[PDB]
Design a protein around this ligand. Structure first.
Ligand SMILES: O=S(=O)(NCc1ccc(S(=O)(=O)c2cccc(O)c2)cc1)c1cc(O)c(O)cc1-c1ccc(O)c(O)c1
Ligand SMILES: O=S(=O)(NCc1ccc(S(=O)(=O)c2cccc(O)c2)cc1)c1cc(O)c(O)cc1-c1ccc(O)c(O)c1
Ligand SMILES: O=P(O)(O)OC[C@H]1O[C@](O)(COP(=O)(O)O)[C@@H](O)[C@@H]1O
Ligand SMILES: O=P(O)(O)OC[C@H]1O[C@](O)(COP(=O)(O)O)[C@@H](O)[C@@H]1O
Ligand SMILES: O=P(O)(O)OC[C@H]1O[C@](O)(COP(=O)(O)O)[C@@H](O)[C@@H]1O
Ligand SMILES: O=P(O)(O)OC[C@H]1O[C@](O)(COP(=O)(O)O)[C@@H](O)[C@@H]1O
Ligand SMILES: O=C([O-])C(=O)[O-]
Ligand SMILES: O=C([O-])C(=O)[O-]
Ligand SMILES: O=C([O-])C(=O)[O-]
Ligand SMILES: O=C([O-])C(=O)[O-]
Ligand SMILES: [K+]
Ligand SMILES: [K+]
Ligand SMILES: [K+]
Ligand SMILES: [K+]
Ligand SMILES: [Mg+2]
Ligand SMILES: [Mg+2]
Ligand SMILES: [Mg+2]
Ligand SMILES: [Mg+2]
Lengths: 422, 425, 425, 436
């Protein structure tokens, strides 16, 4: 029965054609949903009670669209999100961190606009985790956003939105200096022929997967759900194909900001993503990712590949990684393991930001410290295991891969352990 | 010889890639499609697309198959639709550059345990009116297909039966249904209500893959450009859906309300045409052909053996087209199963076969009407040159191009065994 | 039948990985196909008698090597005459006659920089006596090949030049030598003294791989069955060496002292024949054909395009043979480069081409002696029938087998463009 | 190029020109062959073990010291010839020559002693002389038994029973020398520690032109099973009377290594020939060239795909360690082992990195020579009070001996494989360490 669930017959197939033929509608998904859901906050999703429902439905990142609304409006939104998130902090083994992202208005007719500088300053002051920089056309646009974030905003992640021909053509230079990319299909579909957008989406997702950087698929994913309780056949297909393409995050705009079914739209994206993740052809995917990733003398990079290889060999339920900045979890994520990457961190900001990486499940470690570093480490490992058992990721008898470092401080991951649960 | 510009068009850098990841990374929005659109467009005829003038516009936009939905309307209504389609098609019989045959398909109302009384009457209507295809609704088992086949009276055995899979039973009994059907339609509308909406993409991808493996046509249907019923442009999810159905391996893409009752029927056809052309150039032929080749079983049928040699030969020289002489369409279908990048120009004396080959991806029919030559070898040469002259006239061929010619050793269907490499003069 | 798929290592040939392939090798799986790797035997005192030469032709000798490092022109002319007498002693049965090529192995430059004066005299002797191949000793650069070609003059245009790589310079300048040569010989004797003995296997594997990539014949030579000069059976290392040269991709295997001066010249030929047959069945065609196909560049030459379609077609039906009509042998060489499991039966009227095609693996020459038919298509059919009749007589074909026939559209060399699937009657 | 561009800038273009690295990075096997370079020098230590047969030509303690320096890893005693007194003198001479280098335990070279049985002859099973010879082996502390003419699983059970309770640690390598042994191969391999492809008798029992098929099949199955396989007989036959081998002989040795043989053997070449040391030197030189020419890109992928899923932490750690070593071009994998099993599981994935096995067991240190790429280090120090410190001292001993023998340099990356608790069977940790 284990090998009949989560499309395992289709995952073992020798060819991609055999893989497609073996897809079974009766093979149920078992693993936790790996692709993060970004929901846009607006009138339909601003109440603390509504936001609690969206967190339970699966929202991982809350997007504030600075194209509409005042700073007072957005600060109220931020406060409501934080209130709804902290309403579940009572049970630290089941608490879900939610990132806050600021989507800039953009340059419009103009480089970096004066309103954008004021909005970016607002984001730093209000402690946002991510910036979705609108209409990025070159590497110098990213540098301008980075400069506007100042010294207090070094930790904020910059996700460049590609929305026009220039951004697509200069993609490589933008990706090099960005933390990730958003495939902003709305404007892109007006700037380039609508029938060419799928080529740009597939190219940008592929390059981001190659680079190991997060990529978000955005706009009109479940558009009809703004007024209707169920999406169209094209919409469910679109969500599924974005996940199959390799998107780290999927987004909802009007569907959650102004629609009549914001919670239902989140539930739909959650349901589709789970099905699509089980349908991933890991046999060729892991091989291609392995072959494409360059040789490395960075021990974190070397431990990540060894850990993902080890997890595939034993069908590990999870890979528990200790991370400070989230980097060790990101390097595990780039190899697209079938095993969940449970990232145990003390940094609340890192816990929110690792939602950008597919398959990373952040656990904010709030237990009291241990005096001996070795005991402190073991405690954070056992923490990941208890939360994993509570949340359904792990059972007694399961195998896990534990990824740690040799000394405290970020950048020293170099150990991989094969551990049996209880 | 061909130029650097030749190798930058139709996603050729992405097609030459050693891995699927490299292939995705090499996709270029500036790489323009050159080949003719190979995925057929099925448009549903209704109040929005019934007039002879409106139908002429849809043929020019790219409609290859006209679907008559027998869930709505009387026999008198559908016979008027058939007559209007035939009138609009024959309005271009003068100009060989604009004349294209259009298939007529009957979509049944559906069942009850088995074939309904109304369905038997509707199938009899189809035989009497000379329809080419039947889209049999709610097929759940092989005996359902046999019932449709039996209902296609003594005169309708040439009609193609495309079984619509619309429920859990049809998905579970897929293999037995495909074995006895001519092809499949992934009827996503009802399927999305019978099974969880989030599982439909799995059923679509599985059924397309199995149809590609079997060498049988598969249609992706319902809500492809749904918003275009009221809006002139589709959503980002809708264009993505059409593109992904083509990339998945669908032979045909369909329009229902978009053409039958919508405000932009011609614009919806134009949109599907535009997306399909882009998506066909983005197909990863390097791994696709290898997998199709490896998966297809060994064969001692000369048509099947010639088809693989012809597709292999066409890939080797970047052949502008594969010209195949076929009477039933079978030879063109066997070429099509290997998914060549070259156009399959099928020269036939059969008007029905010319209409039905629209079900197979990349098959471009040419109806030949010349009186037969006394020497068979001269009749073959005359039909082969007609394929080249038409090709030249339509933009597929130029002097200096290479084409692969597939013929047989003796007259009559079933003897295809020759593949020739010809230089266009 | 089940028994068919148990012979000639077919389970090992169908394996998904190279590791699975090795694990499936069966010592009880008997070779059925004809031995495709040619045997070159050096003529000397042990193999000069007309009766002895008839035994070597029956044992499997395809090419007779005349070593111009030893003996006078008078000696070599007597050799040539004895070979031709023994070969023509079987010309009474044209359906079973075996052509034998005559190759001249030059003495070399020695201390000189380029072509020696004795080499010029020996090369002109070869042209005067009608030799087919030249094994040019110690080739170090492309200009060495040009010098041999110039010394052959205008009358020696058809002679094939196989460059012997015997030193570090030849290995380093390999690419420029191969570009201008008809093929290569891996002269392991001198090479093993010029470079460290433990590095020779790397040079052999590299040169064979590059020759296979280029589609040019490659010969593995020297000490293959060395112990058989005095002993009736070879060592375990010697049989392994012969088998591995075939598995590496060598078109020809050679015997030097083993046939020229040894006590068991016929037994050495029989041993090489037996090992090569075993090794050819153990070839992993699944990956090999895929790699050859992928590595070969796109082509607008119809012969090149027909060859790949024909090999692809032969694999699809497990064709017993590919019968090709050839004037120069080039059409057979282009089929051979794709390493088909099917025998390439080359029917030719050129006695020289019939002798030279022995350089290409899996090409079985048939010299057709009949005068032309007035109708060219009838002449073409008669030759094809001759191939079928010879192949039936020799055991390559049986009634019911499928065969691929490769012909051209007009008389004369360079016009191959047709591939046909034929059932043996 | 981008998949090796950063590491190329770091390690240099000269690094990537050595040990057939361009040929090893090739996308196809055809490209791999085309890229083989005679100028690309081997850098890695010779990983295929050399088994030399001891006889009149190689019995003296002085001659044996020369053979150990030439590369001999296993000494074979052929019980088809000679008395027990003769073989005991041979064993004593081997041990004397081996211990003459024990002064420096950081550079000492352990040598296994293998007993090759006479065989059943006319009989159906284990002969009476074989029982006496096997008892002799147990009494004299031999490490391996090469059991002649094994034809079924019950033959290896008989050898195991004849070894008695004290010979439980001895490895049984079954010799396949006839059609029955080839046909029942799977049942024999299941119960054996490894196999020897005994080509001499096999070449007389089956057609000589079919032996290469049997060799290639048995090596492939042994590689798939993760068990040692020895290629034997007539490898450098001409070197019995001549100082240089033939072109077929060098080719044969190279092809046995390329086929996947863990060990290569010398029989008459060392036992009775005129050039026993030269034959060992030749096999050493060829094996080093052949190992660099291995197409690791497809090999590792195939080994990985063929090996079944495992819930054994040693098995899981071994594949993660080999994958990690390939990612950074690790100079070595240092593994702590008691029985040699952890080193054997690393070896089955055919890493290009040397597997430096640190052990306290002298028998395990001798027996790991059966596994390709395993370099045994016998640790003689007394245990530390804290187990974690004892472990670290052993790891450091491996790093220091690896630097001393040339395997490691400052700046190199190494993968360290250890367990979480003392005792055999608990390997579960993989560490990436930078050499300082
Ligand atoms: O290796 S993959 O898993 N599969 C990729 C693949 C997709 C198509 C084709 S084909 O040659 O067009 C084809 C062949 C046969 C039948 C056909 O109908 C089509 C081959 C291989 C993967 C790797 C990536 O680098 C990535 O970025 C995403 C994917 C990917 C793509 C689609 C999936 O369904 C999926 O699970 C993963
Ligand atoms: O595709 S091939 O058939 N073989 C290709 C191949 C050979 C080795 C390796 S491996 O990665 O080293 C390896 C993998 C697994 C187990 C192992 O023990 C070894 C993989 C694949 C072929 C192609 C040519 O370009 C050619 O010139 C000759 C051959 C060839 C070589 C050896 C044969 O046994 C054979 O039949 C053919
Ligand atoms: O992903 P990052 O930022 O490199 O953090 C991983 C770090 O986690 C650790 O295992 C634990 O260290 P801390 O005690 O600082 O939490 C480090 O040794 C390692 O460097
Ligand atoms: O695709 P189909 O129905 O098998 O038709 C292919 C047939 O067409 C031909 O090429 C031409 O034959 P006709 O003259 O009868 O049209 C035959 O030789 C071949 O058998
Ligand atoms: O292999 P080559 O030398 O190119 O010769 C192939 C030629 O042989 C033929 O099949 C038969 O021609 P001939 O009648 O001149 O022998 C030609 O059609 C073709 O051009
Ligand atoms: O390879 P083996 O025989 O399983 O031994 C590996 C064992 O060696 C160790 O690394 C060290 O253990 P010891 O203290 O017994 O020498 C263990 O942690 C591990 O279980
Ligand atoms: O801004 C966006 O997200 C877009 O344009 O799609
Ligand atoms: O009938 C159809 O096409 C459907 O239900 O999707
Ligand atoms: O000339 C040769 O053939 C040689 O030197 O081996
Ligand atoms: O016994 C042996 O070693 C043989 O037969 O080769
Ligand atoms: K915005
Ligand atoms: K209907
Ligand atoms: K010579
Ligand atoms: K013995
Ligand atoms: Mg926008
Ligand atoms: Mg329906
Ligand atoms: Mg020489
Ligand atoms: Mg023996």
């Amino acid at each position: 029965a284990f090998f009949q669930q989560q499309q395992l017959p289709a995952a073992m197939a020798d060819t991609f054609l055999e893989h497609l033929c073996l897809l079974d509608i009766d093979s149920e998904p078992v693993a936790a949903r790996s692709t993060s859901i970004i929901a846009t906050i607006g009138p339909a999703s601003r109440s603390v009670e509504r936001l609690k429902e969206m967190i339970k439905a699966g929202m991982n990142i809350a997007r504030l669209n600075f194209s509409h609304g005042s700073h007072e409006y957005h600060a109220e939104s931020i406060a409501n999100v934080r209130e709804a998130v902290e309403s579940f902090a009572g049970s630290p083994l089941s608490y879900r961190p939610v990132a806050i992202a600021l989507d800039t208005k953009g340059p419009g007719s103009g480089g970096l606009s004066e309103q954008d500088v004021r909005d970016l300053r607002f984001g730093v002051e209000h402690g946002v985790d991510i910036v979705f920089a609108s209409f990025v056309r070159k590497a110098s646009d990213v540098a301008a956003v980075r400069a506007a974030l100042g010294p207090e905003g070094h930790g904020i992640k910059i996700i460049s939105k590609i929305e026009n021909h220039e951004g697509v053509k200069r993609f490589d230079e933008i990706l090099e200096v960005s933390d990730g990319i958003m495939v902003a299909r709305g404007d892109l579909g007006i700037e380039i022929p609508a029938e060419k957008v799928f080529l740009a989406q597939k190219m940008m997702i592929g390059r981001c997967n190659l680079a190991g950087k997060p990529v978000v698929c955005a706009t009109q994913m479940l558009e009809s759900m703004i007024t209707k309780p169920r999406p169209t056949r094209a919409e469910t297909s679109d969500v599924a194909n974005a996940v199959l393409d390799g998107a780290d995050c999927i987004m909802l705009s009007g569907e959650t900001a102004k629609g009549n079914f914001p919670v239902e739209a989140v539930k739909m994206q959650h349901a589709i993503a789970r099905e699509a993740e089980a349908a991933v052809y890991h046999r060729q995917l892991f091989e291609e990712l392995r072959r494409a990733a360059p040789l490395s003398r960075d021990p974190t990079e070397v431990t990540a590949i060894g850990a993902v290889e080890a997890a595939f060999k034993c069908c590990a339920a999870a890979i528990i990684v200790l991370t400070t900045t989230g980097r060790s979890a990101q390097l595990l994520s780039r190899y697209r393991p079938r095993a969940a990457v449970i990232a145990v961190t003390r940094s609340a900001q890192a816990a929110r930001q690792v939602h950008l990486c597919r398959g990373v499940f952040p656990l904010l470690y709030r237990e009291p410290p241990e005096a001996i570093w070795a005991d402190d480490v073991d405690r954070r490992v056992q923490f990941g295991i208890e939360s994993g058992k509570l949340r359904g990721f792990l059972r007694v008898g399961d195998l896990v891969i534990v990824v740690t470092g040799w000394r405290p401080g970020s950048g020293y991951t170099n150990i991989m352990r094969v551990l049996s649960i209880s």
